[PDB]
Amino acid sequence: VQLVQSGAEVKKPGASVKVSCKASGYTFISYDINWVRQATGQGLEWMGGMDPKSGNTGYAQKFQGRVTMTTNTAISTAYMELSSLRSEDTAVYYCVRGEQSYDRTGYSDWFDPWGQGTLVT
Amino acid sequence: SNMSLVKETVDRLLKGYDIRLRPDFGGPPVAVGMNIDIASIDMVSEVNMDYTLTMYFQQAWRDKRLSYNVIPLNLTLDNRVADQLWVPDTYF
Amino acid sequence: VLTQPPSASGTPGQRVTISCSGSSSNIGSNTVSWYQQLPGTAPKLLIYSTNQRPSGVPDRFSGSKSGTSASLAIGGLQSEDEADYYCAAWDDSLKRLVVFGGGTRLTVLG
Amino acid sequence: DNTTVFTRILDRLLDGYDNRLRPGLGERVTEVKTDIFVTSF
Numbered sequence: 001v002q003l004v005q006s007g008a009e010v011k012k013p014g015a016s017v018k019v020s021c022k023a024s025g026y027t028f029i030s031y032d033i034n035w036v037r038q039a040t041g042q043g044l045e046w047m048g049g050m051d052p053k054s055g056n057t058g059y060a061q062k063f064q065g066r067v068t069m070t071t072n073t074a075i076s077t078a079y080m081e082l083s084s085l086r087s088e089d090t091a092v093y094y095c096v097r098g099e100q101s102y103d104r105t106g107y108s109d110w111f112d113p114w115g116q117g118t119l120v121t
Numbered sequence: 122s123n124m125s126l127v128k129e130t131v132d133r134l135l136k137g138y139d140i141r142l143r144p145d146f147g148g149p150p151v152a153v154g155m156n157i158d159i160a161s162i163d164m165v166s167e168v169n170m171d172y173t174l175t176m177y178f179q180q181a182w183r184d185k186r187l188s189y190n191v192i193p194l195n196l197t198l199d200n201r202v203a204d205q206l207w208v209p210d211t212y213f
Numbered sequence: 214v215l216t217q218p219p220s221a222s223g224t225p226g227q228r229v230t231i232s233c234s235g236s237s238s239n240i241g242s243n244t245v246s247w248y249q250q251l252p253g254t255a256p257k258l259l260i261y262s263t264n265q266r267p268s269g270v271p272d273r274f275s276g277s278k279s280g281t282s283a284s285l286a287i288g289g290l291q292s293e294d295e296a297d298y299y300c301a302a303w304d305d306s307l308k309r310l311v312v313f314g315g316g317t318r319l320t321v322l323g
Numbered sequence: 324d325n326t327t328v329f330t331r332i333l334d335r336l337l338d339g340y341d342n343r344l345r346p347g348l349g350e351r352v353t354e355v356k357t358d359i360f361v362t363s364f
């Protein structure tokens with residue numbers, strides 16, 4: 001598959017940002033989109049997740065009240081709304097399709113395709 | 122704590138409990154109240170002259186031996202303890 | 214937290230291992246999955262379900278899991294194995310939560 | 324002697340446990356996360 005995401009954005013602190021990636025190559029409903037941040041100087045950090053078929057989200061503890069991951073089934077595009085920006089929210093925001101395999105002995109989950117897409121504040 | 126407190130409560134209730142003796146053995150009769158939540162009446166067979174019914178058959182009585190004061194909450198015990206209590210010998 | 218060595222060293226041809234540690238709620242209960250990230254691009258899946266390997270990754274790479282720790286063995290180390298390797302592990306503290314490791318910068322001595 | 328520690332843990336794990344009282348009998352509410360895999364309908 002592939003997850004084509006949006007271009008780079010530049011905004012000052014406090015201005016809510018917009019980042020979206022359109023899912024192409026698979027049934028956008030079967031798999032759940034997850035968002036991941038990666039500060040240039042440091043490693044990956046999980047932003048949150050949300051099942052498109054329902055719309056239920058699982059935001060990380062440290063972005064509990066700042067992120068809004070909605071989706072549009074019609075266009076097969078999912079996007080977040082990070083608000084209350086600071087100087088430390090500059091990082092490349094990937095959107096990763098979370099594949100899953102369930103069977104007799106429990107779940108096993110992973111982020112298969114990944115994307116791209118930067119942001120600086 | 123609470124968990125242990127109840128552990129000793131129930132252990133004390135069951136220690137020295139004679140399952141062979143009904144509530145108030147030497148006293149007045151014990152009164153058993155019954156409910157039935159009929160879950161289903163499956164098959165009424167005219168050939169076998171019988172029917173089948175699944176129910177939640179419930180009984181309620183008083184057993185002064187099983188009285189406690191040191192907690193207020195309604196106790197619900199694992200079903201395996203029903204082997205160690207006195208339960209009426211009801212039959213259909 | 215998923216602590217793993219900040220970096221690793223290896224000369225070509227020597228098997229080297231990246232190891233990650235975590236509580237019993239993330240790696241003990243669930244399965245890890247390693248993510249390579251060649252410098253200057255986006256990370257891509259490397260190992261999933263702690264053993265299996267996607268179509269495209271050579272048998273060169275393998276994964277393992279012992280109790281509350283997981284290890285990525287990079288056998289036959291080559292030049293193009295210079296990257297950062299991250300491990301993820303779904304945690305059961307909440308209904309949806311993953312934990313990415315700090316990352317391990319693997320260099321190729323020479 | 325890896326077996327000694329395993330057996331010690333297995334024997335000690337059940338000391339004082341009352342299997343008639345659900346975990347958190349008065350402190351909490353027992354959350355049970357259920358899951359089903361239907362081998363055949």
Ligand SMILES: *[C@@H]1O[C@H](CO)[C@@H](O[C@@H]2O[C@H](CO)[C@@H](O)[C@H](O)[C@H]2NC(C)=O)[C@H](O)[C@H]1NC(C)=O
Pocket residue numbers: 193194195
């Ligand atoms: C034990 O169970 C009884 C029976 O359900 C509970 O009695 C009820 O208590 C509420 C108040 O908390 C009353 O409004 C109801 O009318 C009571 N029902 C009956 C049938 O008595 C009781 O609360 C439970 N706990 C204790 C400590 O008694």
